[PDB]
Structure 1
Amino acid sequence: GYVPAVVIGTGYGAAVSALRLGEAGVQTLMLEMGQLWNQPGPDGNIFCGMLNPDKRSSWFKNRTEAPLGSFLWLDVVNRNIDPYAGVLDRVNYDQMSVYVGRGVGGGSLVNGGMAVEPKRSYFEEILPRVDSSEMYDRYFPRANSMLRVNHIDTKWFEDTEWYKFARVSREQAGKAGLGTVFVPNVYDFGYMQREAAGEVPKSALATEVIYGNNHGKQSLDKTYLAAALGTGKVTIQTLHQVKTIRQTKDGGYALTVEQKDTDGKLLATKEISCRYLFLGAGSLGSTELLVRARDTGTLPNLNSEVGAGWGPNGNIMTARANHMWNPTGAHQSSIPALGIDAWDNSDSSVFAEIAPMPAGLETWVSLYLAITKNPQRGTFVYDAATDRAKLNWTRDQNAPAVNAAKALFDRINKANGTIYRYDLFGTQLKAFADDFCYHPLGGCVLGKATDDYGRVAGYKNLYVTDGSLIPGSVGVNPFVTITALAERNVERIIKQDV
């Protein structure tokens, strides 16, 4: 059937867009391929934890996986599982594996909550056509408020066993002349205190994050999406995957949509049409829909920039072995609190998340997710044979990112007389994991594939809203940028187009 606006997906771009559409009185249907995560499972919890993964951990995989960095300790809990509509999806391309959330709320379900604005000077470099004053004066503050961003209590942080891992890396970085910053979060830090005090059910302090948090984390289902539903103008249909998009003869859009059960069985195929179509299927999902539409002839007026300009936000994982006198703790909060800020906009820039280890015993390992400035980009190329977008990125394209991460952590090792771990990412001696991504950015870049507000070039009333808009890099964890840009874009679109 017909509905005035359709939003594909329910991540950050989608959730912002649907809230503002509903507030403007536009009846809106959101289509989400994953589940609404609200049913207690076999342990009485909605989500599995990192030490008890089960089918809920994984989108259609036959075996659980250890979180990257943790295989040496967490492989013991891996098990065979039924392919199921679980929450975290590892999407494998030829030389890159991208992790994304699947469910109502998208990556907000599975992410570490780190809610950080990019440096304005870097924002201005990456998106020179965008008015940065409005972003920093209006849209970033709006996003932080709506997302329920909050700040850790520094005294509690300094004293608690749960953040010893962070304090150790702070001290070690400091000996190399490198500073740290507290990173705001959407996990409720007041709740986290009460967890440590034994007052409320643990989540961050019970090795939960990457397969969901049963408590504490203000994912989008609690914030933007709850508000969108509260307008009375928004509904969400789950286990509905959009496959194809075409433009009707009178200039609206028609979608083919598959409805599945949680075992992946096809229940129905539906046609849904609309006046305004908003893509919020993520860097991977929105880009795939548009390259498919271009290259199968259903949106033939899409431009050549659709598919282009993808990067992994310079993501590189690495780890250091601490001295025996610098244990990182058996008890590590699953939510990061600190980053090493070595980002100066040069090619040696690094912003490094100090990541927790979920082993639950002492390993002496410090783990880092480095975010770097690497100009290499990949392209999603349609394969008509298999009907998939294939990202053409090669591992050698991450060499500049590795080089920047290694230069920084070499300074820390030199100052402290420590060495890397080489055994955390597989049998091959490898200190830097260079073929994964948690922060996919690009594919439908703002001002390239779209105008400066995400209006898809070649088409009217067709919008992209999400991480596919970002040109490969933001220098920090990306969801605040995605949210703030989505606030800017939908406000303009409603004013001028709707």
Structure 2
Amino acid sequence: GYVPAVVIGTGYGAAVSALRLGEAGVQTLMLEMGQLWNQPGPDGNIFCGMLNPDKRSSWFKNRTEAPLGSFLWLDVVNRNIDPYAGVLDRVNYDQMSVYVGRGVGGGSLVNGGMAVEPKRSYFEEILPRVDSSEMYDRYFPRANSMLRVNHIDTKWFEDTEWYKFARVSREQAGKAGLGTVFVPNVYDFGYMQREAAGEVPKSALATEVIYGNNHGKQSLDKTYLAAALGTGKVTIQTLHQVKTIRQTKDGGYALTVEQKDTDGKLLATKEISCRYLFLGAGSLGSTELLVRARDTGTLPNLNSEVGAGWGPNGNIMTARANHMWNPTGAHQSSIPALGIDAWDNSDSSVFAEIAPMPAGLETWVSLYLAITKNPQRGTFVYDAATDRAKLNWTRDQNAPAVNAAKALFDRINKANGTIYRYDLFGTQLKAFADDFCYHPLGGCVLGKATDDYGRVAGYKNLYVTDGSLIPGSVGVNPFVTITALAERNVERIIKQDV
């Protein structure tokens, strides 16, 4: 049916948008292709852990996969599974695999919780048409509060076995002159202390994160989406995937929407129309909808920037082998707390997560997810034959990212007399994983495919809200930026357009 506003998806951009729309009195329907994650499963928990993956781990795959970096220890727990509407989707393109959440809350269900503001000077570099004072004075603080960002207690961090892995990399980095920083998070660190004390059910301290956290993590279903539902003006329909978008002859937008069951069986195809349409389907999903609409003629006045300007936030994974006297511990919290800040906006910049590993026995490995500054960009190109927008990115386009990550970690290896691991990513000697992405950014870039508030060029009352707006790179883990930009955008759109 008709609803005044429709929001596609339920990740960060969508959730911010729907809350503010509901508070403005606009009746809003959110359409989410994944599940509402609230049913206890066969182990009694909503989500599977990383040591007991099952069909809940995976969006329509027939075998579970180890978390990147951990195949050598976690392949032993992999199993064949039925294709199911599980929580983590590895989306395979020709030379890049992008990992995204599927469910009410999007990537907030599966991510590491790390809530980090970009460097202002870098924000000003990447988005010069945006007023940076309103961002830092108003919208970043708003996002910080609504997301429930909190900070680890330094004494607990220093003392607990669960963060030895982080302390080891801190000491190694320091020998190279390189500094670390604490990482704020939406996982409740008070709760985490109580997990370590045996006082509450474990989640971060029971090898859970990438298939969801059964406790502790304030994903968007608990924060923005709960508040949106609380307005009385927002509803969410799950297992509903938008397939096509058109402008109707009488104005507004009409959507074709498939309703499936959790086995992927098609139950219904619905037509849903609206006055205001907000896309929050992610970098991949929003871009695909718009490239499809342009190239199949349902939104023919979309511009040539739709599809362009994608980058993986410079994501590169690598690992170092510690000396035998620097074990990282069998018990590693699944939530990172420390990073190495070597980001000065130059082409050598690196912001690298000190990543836990879930093996649960001693491996001596330190793992890192580096964020780098690499100008290469890809384009999503519609394939009418298969009805899919294909990402044309080639692995050689990550060479600048590898080079930057390697230069930084070479400094650490030289100072400490250590070497890389070469065997964590596959059998071929490969120290740098260069064909994955957790942080897809771009495809519908702010001010190029859209105006400076995400209004899609060529159309009225058509908005993009999410990671597709960002120009390929933010220099930090991206959800705080997506959230704050969405706060800015929806406030302005409601004031001027609604």
Give yes or no for TM over 0.5.
yes
| Pair 1:219 & 2:216 matched | no
Q: Shift of the alpha carbon at 1:162?
A: 0.1
1:5-404 alignment, distance < 5 Å: 5-404=5-404
**1:477 & 1:213 partners in 2: Cα distance?**
19
Aligned counterparts of 2:223 and 2:241: Cα–Cα separation in 1: 23
Whole-angstrom CA distance in 1 between matches of 2:431 and 2:252: 51
**Local SS of the residue matching 2:273:** strand
Distance in 2 of aligned mates of 1:198 and 1:189? 14
Please report how far the alpha carbon of residue 250 of structure 1 lies from its aligned counterpart in structure 2 after TM superposition. 2.2
Distance 1:473 1:25 in 2: 34
Deviation at 1:306, TM superposition (A): 0.0
| Secondary structure at the counterpart of residue 272 of structure 1 | strand
Distance 1:183 1:207 in 2: 19
Note the alpha carbon deviations across 1:94-120, whole angstroms, 9 max, x for none.
000000000000000000000000000
**How far apart, in 2, do the equivalents of 1:181 and 1:251 lie?**
51
Alpha-carbon offset, residue 407 of structure 1: 0.1
| CA distance in 2: counterparts of 1:292 and 1:350, whole angstroms | 35
Q: SS at the partner of 2:255? A: strand
Compute the displacement of 1:458 (Å): 0.1
In 2, Cα distance between equivalents of 1:195 and 1:137: 36
1:189-240 Cα offsets, whole Å, 9 max, x none, are 0000000000000000000000000000000000000000000000000000
1:254-308 Cα distance to aligned partner (Å, 9 max, x none): 0000000000000000000000000000000000000000000000000000000
1:471 Cα deviation after fit: 0.1
C-alpha offsets along residues 327-357 of structure 1, whole Å, 9 cap, x if unaligned?
0000000000000000000000000000001
SS at match of 2:149: coil
Cα distance in structure 2, aligned partners of 1:381 and 1:359: 39
Query: Structure 2 CA distance, aligned partners of 1:59 and 1:144?
Result: 30
SS across alignment from 2:144 = helix
Question: What is the deviation of 1:320?
Answer: 0.0
Q: How many Å separate the matches in 2 of 1:150 and 1:47?
A: 23
**C-alpha distance in 1 between matches for 2:251 and 2:398:** 42
Alpha-carbon separation, structure 1, partners of 2:169 and 2:372: 19
Q: State the partner residue of 1:455.
A: 455
Question: CA offset at residue 251 of structure 1?
Answer: 2.1
Q: Distance in 1 between matches of 2:22 and 2:401?
A: 41
**Structure 1 Cα separation of the partners of residues 16 and 316 of structure 2:** 29
TM superposition shift of 1:443 = 0.1
CA deviations 1:461-482 (Å, max 9, x no partner) are 0000000000000000000000
In the alignment, the residues of structure 2 paired with residue 119 and residue 153 of structure 1 have an alpha-carbon distance, to the nearest angstrom, of 23
User: Partners in 2 of 1:250 and 1:133 — Cα distance?
Assistant: 40
Aligned pair count reads 498
The whole-number CA distance in structure 1 between the counterparts of 2:240 and 2:249 is: 25
Deviations 1:106-140 (A, max 9, x none): 00000000000000000000000000000001000
Q: Matched residues in 1 for 2:249 and 2:17: separation?
A: 26
CA distance in structure 1 between the partners assigned to 2:136 and 2:181 by the alignment: 19
Query: What is the distance in 2 between the residues matched to 1:318 and 1:250?
Result: 54
Per-residue CA distance 1:364-393 (angstroms, 9 max, x = gap): 000000000000000000000000000000
Cα separation, 1, equivalents of 2:48 and 2:439? 22
- Write the distance in 2 (CA, Å) between the matches of 1:454 and 1:73: 44
Q: Distance in 2 between matches of 1:53 and 1:30?
A: 29
CA deviation string 1:30-89 (max 9, x = no partner): 000000000000000000000000000000000000000000000000000000000000
Cα separation, 2, equivalents of 1:68 and 1:400 = 21
What's the secondary structure of 1:134's corresponding residue?
Answer: helix
- Structure 2 distance, partners of 1:176, 1:455, is 46
Mapped to 2, the partners of 1:246 and 1:75 lie a distance apart of 45
Deviations 1:3-39 (A, max 9, x none): 0000000000000000000000000000000000000
Give, in whole Å, the separation in 1 of the partners of 2:134 and 2:415: 42
Tell me the distance in 2 between the aligned counterparts of 1:171 and 1:141.
Answer: 32
Percent of residue pairs identical: 100
SS in structure 1 at match of 2:3: coil
Task: Give the superposition deviation at 1:249.
Answer: 1.3
Counterpart-to-counterpart distance in 2, 1:141 and 1:171: 32
2: CA distance between counterparts of 1:494 and 1:220? 22
Q: Distance in 2 between matches of 1:491 and 1:167?
A: 42
Q: TM-score, normalised by structure 1?
A: 1.00
CA RMSD in angstroms, aligned pairs only: 0.2
Q: Helix, strand or coil: the match of 1:390? A: strand
Q: Deviations over 1:388-417 (max 9, x none)?
A: 000000000000000000000000000000
SS at match of 1:275: strand
C-alpha distance in structure 2 between counterparts of 1:364 and 1:140, whole Å: 38
3-state DSSP of counterpart to 1:4: strand
